[PDB]
Design a protein around this ligand. Sequence first.
Ligand SMILES: [K+]
Ligand SMILES: [K+]
Lengths: 310, 310
Amino acid sequence: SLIYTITLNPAIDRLLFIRGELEKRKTNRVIKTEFDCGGKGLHVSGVLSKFGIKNEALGIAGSDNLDKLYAILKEKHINHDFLVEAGTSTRECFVVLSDDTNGSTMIPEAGFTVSQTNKDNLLKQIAKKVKKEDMVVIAGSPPPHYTLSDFKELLRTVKATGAFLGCDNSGEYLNLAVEMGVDFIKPNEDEVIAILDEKTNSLEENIRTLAEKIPYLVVSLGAKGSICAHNGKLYQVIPPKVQERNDTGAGDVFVGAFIAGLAMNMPITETLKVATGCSASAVMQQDSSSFDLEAAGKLKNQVSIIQLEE
Amino acid sequence: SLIYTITLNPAIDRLLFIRGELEKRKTNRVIKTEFDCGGKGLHVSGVLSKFGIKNEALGIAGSDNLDKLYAILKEKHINHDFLVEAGTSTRECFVVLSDDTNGSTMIPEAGFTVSQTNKDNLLKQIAKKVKKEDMVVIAGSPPPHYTLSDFKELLRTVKATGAFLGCDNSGEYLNLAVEMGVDFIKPNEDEVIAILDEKTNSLEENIRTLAEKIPYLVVSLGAKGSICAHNGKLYQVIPPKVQERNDTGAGDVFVGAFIAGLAMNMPITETLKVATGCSASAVMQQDSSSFDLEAAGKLKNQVSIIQLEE
Ligand SMILES: [K+]
Ligand SMILES: [K+]
């Protein structure tokens, strides 16, 4: 079986290293420039490849900087079968950070216009490639003019294959994934509340209710960890405390590692420890997408899981 | 006669338009991307061309994004005879601004390594092209590894032609231009004080002393205007008050317009009014390099000039 990621709006992440804080309305000299691939689906693929789990990245990239994107992907051991949009470039996201500080400032370009030809080609690729035994992870917002109905077509095309379908999305796109019955989502608490438009039940009751439509539900609670609902059970996941450097993109690492755990047929509790361990390792790294596999192994074994009753 | 500009470290300015303030440690979505040419010498050439004054831009650009740079230059009506560094790209400066706010945040890449071959080629171009009746304006810092001695060779090569030589530079590079006797510099007050390492005389006395080595000396006083020393006279230049949008690059506009005034054989006082008028117009524009020629004409005629006695 295989794992496919779908990155509707990939990016070349340009990391701009400066001295000290970013000062607005001032000149902030770049000490060094580094390049990474962006778009959540690509981060997920990078994580899976780090686990040695076979996967293929799908999405739509621009022809004009395609050589640059492919060289980065090769560097990150990401196998892909991207569709190419002629006469455009994959967007850049500018990531302003410092060796001297914590966190990063994200300045992303929006993305290009995907042709109906390529929208259709994506749907066809899914039909031709994806089997019932595979997993498909759609991660990241669509580019401008890739509409809600486009996204509906996409979800249903995956669903018709019988494959496991995970969605790491936000806003209206996340609302759709719930309505249409995907297998996995990773909303935060406010997203759970917004999806249900429910203001007076406990968060735990909201999660148990949302679990009636989502078989693998992980709710992020920021620093406090996660609550996962699976098979009528509810798990509180508490991460180890770590020296935090930058939590940007740690959510994508969690997704990659969680899917990895599932693909390795790990029990849900072990999968949650693996995902949380990798995510905690990522928070310790200054960049957006990376994590330390050996440190993640140790942090996995410092995660506590409590089953919540009733 | 001709005017040559020298941009040792040109840039493609990428203007990143966002909503509201730039928030560090947060995502700042780009609404639109615009492109401009950067490097002070190129700004100067753009201004001269806007005046209809024939000029040629010299410098060293990277081969890898040369088509992009040339298309921008064509768009800005900048004639050029750039040297090309193989296997590299002209640096980008990222300029974060908003329609909703004032000012801009500059995030410049440092520039590439110029080969000795191209350093030598620049010196040769100067020898072959530049005549006693021409003007040469060196504006902007050299790229990494273009040294103080490299810059000395550059200044002396220009001086040997007999041409008028203006330098818009900072730090050690500005110190050199004073020692070696250029015709024009535009230091700020602190730079004047640093050049002379003189802490106890009046600023006016510092300027009159520096004027013994610089025939066209303009000292910027920020919002208060300028003091210019020429031919044993001292002029206080007071700009009109304007609705300010972004003063970034207004100094380059002043230089272009000041040189323009000189090339049009305008009396010094008229030249100062023109330069200040154009600079005030530039402060009213949101971007880095532009100004309104018609508004600048009006603002020129609102500038007051007082001759300071003794
Ligand atoms: K990180
Ligand atoms: K401006």
